[PDB]
Every structure is written in structure tokens, then in C-alpha cells.
Design a protein around this ligand. Structure first.
Ligand SMILES: *[C@@H]1O[C@H](CO)[C@@H](O)[C@H](O)[C@H]1NC(C)=O
Lengths: 225, 214, 60
């Protein structure tokens, strides 16, 4: 039934602007308002604004007034969000949402704005970074009878990287942390493994790092000092 | 104009346990403008409740909403693996919508103290112009833990970043990594690098450290 | 010209082994990117080039 399709991820230099597209599939186009909700990494849901297409009833969030424009293309039945003067606080996932309501409303010609959102788009990832595609550099993390070693996969762009240990043969005690975006605009994560301290002189520990946007496949040997 | 607050920050539940989430409004509002949303760790948000008490289509009897005036509650019974996640209340009356800060509902288990490790900068990284010191907090519960970097006993701020793993499905613990970012020039001036860890499972703050070189 | 080609780097280090790629206008621009990548990873060795496969190699 009523379903919302959103455009793919976008990367924008700081200070510039980005435009997302949301296309409803099913139902009507001018009855129910499209409300945009965004989420910054590790933060709560934030309402950006809402607009009934064509009809012209719209409101912007106080934080996004003077920076936000919501509009539509009536021929293509597509709504757009434009945010200007992007900063690091604008990095996040942007969802277009609406209320299903009467769905395929027949002869309604009525406008509804204040409703909950039970229909969500997949979300559009917006990354505010002045960085270009860059492969990662891999640094070792050298170490009650248990020790820890790992790999620091640093300064790559964009997401994601895949990390395994011993071609994937070592999986017990492995923690690959979520990548953090540092102030330089590049991503960085670590992957760790806990082993018995007796195994340090014995076992070999190799982490396999994959970054497909850069076509990087790299093996690093982690040795104790 | 209307601010929504939720309590608690984190809610820990056993299998059969029943928990209650609170949504506190800044002023007296009508129950017709309150919704509840569920956010799984890797999914788009889902609507659970509209108009304070109206259950959305396809939402089981497990979730019920109540409230009046300024205090609204969501009650969860027979919590199931799908249900663990972040819960947000929303006000959608008037012109400007607002969300609550959210409450994470995780799996309850016995408190377990973290194992703390500190990792010196690799020699490969030093000849690159930057230096990263990594501190690892392994398999702890509950989720919240504080990490403070002390370079020659001088507290740091703004030059560290940390991230946490999702709660393990097996043993229901958390893991944390903190990276302190230093320029090579700054790294050479100082001698003491320490990681101060504060957690409920530790009787007193645990500190792991090393000295540049040895 | 705004047209780029893809160049490969092969890493034969004592602890770091693998490969990465970059898009550059010419090989001279590609090598500067690869030599920075190797220095960032602490790999210091000999460089060879194969213009047929647009492939650099650094071995320790
Ligand atoms: C809400 O209404 C109740 C009952 O009228 C009143 O006692 C209370 O003080 C009001 N609180 C606010 C914040 O308006």
C-alpha cells in the first residue's frame, strides 16, 4: 500500500547544501503532510519540518528555519528537502514520513497535517565531510591470564570497512567497534580480540581489512612488543 | 514551545518482567497529540501508539499507552527480543512537532566489571605525524561507563572519541573503545599516558597507563 | 583532461601485505598518492612499476 521511496546517500562539503528526494508509492499526493525526521549518530529523533504537497501548508523546525526549504514537483509526484549551510551537526539519517490515513482517499479533497507517522521511508544518509575517497591505514594494537590485541583502522572514507581475523577463522572474543567520524572528516574504527596471555608468544594474529570503495584488501600481523 | 522529557535514560528488563516508560511534557497537553515510536538497533522507526492510547495497526497487545495532563506512560509486558531498542514519545499537535530524548531498553543481567587495556601508539603511526592511544573496556554491564584521559595527570577534553558495541545477544555485555588523538609533536613532549575508567562494577576508578618508550 | 584511470598498489611488507587502488590522471600523480599511503602505513621498501597493468609494488 502507501509506501515512501527515498534517494540514495549524499556527501557534501561543509558550508554547502544538499537536496533529498522522497517519492510516495500508492495512495494520494495532496491529502497528507510529509514530515521529515532526522537522526544524528547516537542521538534522538529530531523533527525537521512538514509540508502538505501542492496545498502549501508547511512548518519548519525552529532550528532549521532560515536554512530549510521544502518543495515538491507535481508532475513527478516527488517531494524534496533542501538544507543549506551544512555543518557537522547535520550529519545523520533523514526520513520522510507520513500518516496512512484513508490511504487511497476517494474524492476527499481534504488536508491533514497533525498526525502520527506510521509510514517511513528507508532513510537517506547525509555525510557532511570535506573528504574524498581514501583507503584506510592499519595500525596494530600491541599488548587475569587474558590479554587484548587489535587493529586500528584509521583515516578512510567512506563507510564501510570489513574486519576479520585469520581469514575469519578466529571469531571468539572479537569486537569490531562502530566507526567514528573524526574532526578531519575521515572515519576510524578498531577491532579487538581477547586471548589467553600464554598464546602471545605462540599464536599468530592477523587482521584482514576490506574497504571496497577503495578496493583495499590488507593483512596486518599483530605482534607483541 | 513544548518540551518532552523521558525517564529513565535506560531501562533494564528480564524475560518475564514488565516495564514502564514515562513521557513528561512541559505543559498540560491533550492526549490526542501523543505518539510512541520504537527503534530497533538496525531498522527505521516503527509507530506503536497514536493519540496516547490508540494502538497502531499490527501492534500486539504487549504495548499499551496511557496518560493525561503532562504525564504519559508506555507499558511493556512480556518483553520480546524484537522489543529491545530505543523508545521515543512524540508530540504532534500545533505547528511544530517534537520528540522526547528516547529511552533505550536493554536486557537485564548481573553487573560485570570491565577489563581495561591501554594501547600505546604504533611506531608505524608515529612516523606519519599523528599519534593515537587506544583504551579498551571489555565485556561490562551496565552500559554507562566514563573514560577520562590524563596526560601527565592533565585532564583532556575535545581530543578524544569513543564508541560502544551493541549489547551482545549471548552474554548481554557491552564493549567500549576510546581513541585519544595527538599530533606527533605533542606526543613527544609528555611522558605519562593514563586511562581512567569509572564504572558501577568497579569499587574505585581503575587506571591503566604506560610511559613513552618504557 | 578530466578523464582518470585506475592504478593498483601492491604492498609486500614484513607485517602489512595486500593491495589498494587509486584514480589519477597519470601515473606520476598516482605514485605520489601511493607513496603517501605507504608512508602513512609505515611501509618503506623498493618500488617497481608495470605499465601494462598500471600496478605499483613496494616490497620490504
Ligand atoms: C495541569 O492541570 C492540572 C489540573 O488542572 C493542574 O493542577 C496543574 O498545575 C497543571 N499543570 C501545568 C503545568 O499546566
Amino acid at each position: 500500500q502507501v509506501q515512501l521511496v527515498q534517494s540514495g546517500a549524499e556527501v557534501r562539503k561543509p558550508g554547502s547544501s544538499v537536496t533529498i528526494s522522497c517519492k510516495p508509492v500508492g495512495g494520494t499526493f495532496t491529502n497528507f503532510a510529509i514530515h521529515w525526521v532526522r537522526q544524528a549518530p547516537g542521538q534522538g529523533l529530531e523533527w525537521v519540518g512538514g509540508r502538505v504537497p501542492v496545498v502549501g501548508i508547511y512548518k519548519y523546525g525552529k532550528k532549521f528555519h532560515d536554512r530549510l526549504r521544502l518543495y515538491e514537483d507535481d508532475p513527478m509526484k516527488t517531494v524534496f528537502l533542501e538544507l543549506r549551510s551544512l555543518t557537522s551537526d547535520d550529519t545523520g539519517v533523514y526520513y520522510c514520513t507520513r500518516w496512512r490515513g484513508c490511504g487511497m482517499c476517494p474524492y476527499d479533497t481534504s488536508s491533514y497535517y497533525n498526525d502520527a507517522s506510521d509510514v517511513w521511508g528507508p532513510g537517506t544518509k547525509v555525510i557532511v565531510s570535506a573528504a574524498s575517497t581514501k583507503g584506510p591505514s592499519v595500525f596494530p594494537l600491541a599488548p587475569g591470564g587474558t590479554a587484548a590485541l587489535g587493529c586500528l583502522v584509521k583515516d578512510y572514507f567512506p563507510e564501510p570497512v570489513t574486519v576479520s581475523w585469520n581469514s575469519g577463522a578466529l571469531t571468539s572474543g572479537v569486537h569490531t567497534f562502530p566507526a567514528v567520524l573524526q574532526s578531519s572528516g575521515l572515519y576510524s574504527l578498531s577491532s579487538v580480540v581477547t586471548v589467553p596471555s600464554s598464546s602471545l608468544g605462540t599464536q599468530t594474529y592477523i587482521c584482514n581489512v576490506n574497504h571496497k570503495p577503495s578496493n583495499t584488501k590488507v593483512d596486518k600481523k599483530v605482534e607483541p612488543k | 514551545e513544548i518540551v518532552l522529557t523521558q525517564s529513565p535514560v535506560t531501562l533494564s528488563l528480564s524475560s518475564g518482567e514488565t516495564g514502564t516508560l514515562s513521557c513528561r511534557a512541559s505543559q498540560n497537553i491533550s492526549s490526542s497529540w501523543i505518539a510512541w515510536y520504537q527503534q530497533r538497533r538496525g531498522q527505521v522507526p516503527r509507530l506503536l501508539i497514536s493519540a496516547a492510547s490508540a494502538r497502531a495497526a499490527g501492534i500486539p497487545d504487549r504495548f499499551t499507552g496511557r496518560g493525561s495532563g503532562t504525564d504519559f506512560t508506555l507499558t511493556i509486558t512480556r518483553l520480546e527480543p524484537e522489543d529491545f531498542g530505543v523508545y521515543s514519545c512524540q508530540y504532534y499537535g500545533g505547528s511544530f512537532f517534537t520528540f522526547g530524548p528516547g529511552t533505550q531498553v536493554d536486557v537485564k543481567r548481573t553487573v560485570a566489571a570491565p577489563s581495561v587495556f591501554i594501547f600505546p601508539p604504533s611506531d608505524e603511526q608515529l612516523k606519519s605525524g599523528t599519534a593515537s592511544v587506544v583504551c579498551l573496556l571489555n565485556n561490562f554491564y551496565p552500559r554507562e561507563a566514563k573514560v577520562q584521559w590524563k596526560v601527565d595527570n592533565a585532564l583532556q577534553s575535545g581530543n578524544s572519541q569513543e564508541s560502544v558495541t551493541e549489547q551482545d545477544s549471548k552474554d548481554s555485555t557491552y564493549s567500549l573503545s576510546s581513541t585519544l588523538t595527538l599530533s606527533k609533536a605533542d606526543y613527544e613532549k609528555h611522558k605519562v599516558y593514563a586511562c581512567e575508567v569509572t564504572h558501577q562494577g568497579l569499587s574505585s576508578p581503575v587506571t591503566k597507563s604506560f610511559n613513552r618508550g618504557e | 583532461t578530466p578523464a582518470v584511470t585506475t592504478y593498483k598498489l601492491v604492498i609486500n611488507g614484513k607485517t602489512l601485505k595486500g593491495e589498494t587502488t587509486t584514480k589519477a590522471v597519470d601515473a606520476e600523480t598516482a605514485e605520489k598518492a601511493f607513496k603517501q599511503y605507504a608512508n602513512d602505513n609505515g611501509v618503506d621498501g623498493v618500488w617497481t612499476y608495470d605499465d601494462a597493468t598500471k600496478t605499483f609494488t613496494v616490497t620490504e
